[PDB]
Design a protein around this ligand. Structure first.
Ligand SMILES: CNCc1ccc(Oc2ccccc2)cc1
Length: 188
């Protein structure tokens, strides 16, 4: 009983059938999500412990940042459709929270242009119904679990990570505890 329901994780009372195996939610407006991604590298370290054949999904949410918050969910959909998440995640986080130079949908587009996505390719994707379906999927998954806080991670539709029960004196130990818990939960 080294991992206890209620301590390092909680159990959903209404488990979600058909869910992705590892499902992470975030917002580019979310201060802890900035730490999680830019300083701790949570997603990457989880993936390096996950068993073979367990895939990881990451989705943006609407409920922070009003109008721009919703623009960012559609931009994340563009990032997923074009496969350029690894190129835009850092300048989007920094544009929103560090330099505070992202203030409109056009400013979001600038980050993609600077990362090398051609202007016509971004605009075609942005207006595509493939991207509209990806926005729909992101919203659906958040609604499925009554999501009200980010950062958040879910395993096999049944378990939600609880980082509040982890020591933060050392950032590397914390990340390792987090990844090892996702691994334990995926095996279960
Ligand atoms: C819902 N928030 C989750 C959470 C909990 C603790 C936490 O502590 C850290 C903050 C910054 C850097 C390292 C750890 C960060 C996020």
């Amino acid at each position: 009983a080294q991992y206890e329901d209620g301590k390092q994780y909680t159990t959903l009372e209404k488990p979600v059938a058909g869910a992705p195996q590892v499902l992470e939610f975030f917002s580019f407006f979310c201060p802890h999500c900035y730490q999680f991604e830019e300083v701790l590298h949570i997603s990457d370290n989880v993936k390096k412990k996950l068993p073979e054949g367990v895939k990881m999904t990451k989705y943006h949410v609407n409920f922070m940042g009003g109008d721009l918050g919703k623009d960012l969910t559609q931009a994340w959909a563009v990032a997923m459709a074009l496969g350029v998440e690894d190129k835009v995640t850092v300048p989007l986080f920094e544009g929103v929270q560090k330099t505070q130079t992202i203030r409109s949908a056009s400013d979001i587009r600038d980050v993609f242009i600077n990362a090398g996505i051609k202007g016509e390719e971004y605009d075609a994707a942005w207006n595509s119904f493939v991207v509209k379906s990806l926005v729909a999927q992101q919203e659906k998954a958040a609604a499925d679990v009554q999501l009200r806080g980010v950062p958040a991670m879910f395993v096999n539709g049944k378990y939600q990570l609880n980082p509040q029960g982890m020591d933060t004196s050392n950032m590397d130990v914390f990340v390792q505890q987090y990844a090892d818990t996702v691994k334990y939960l995926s095996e279960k």
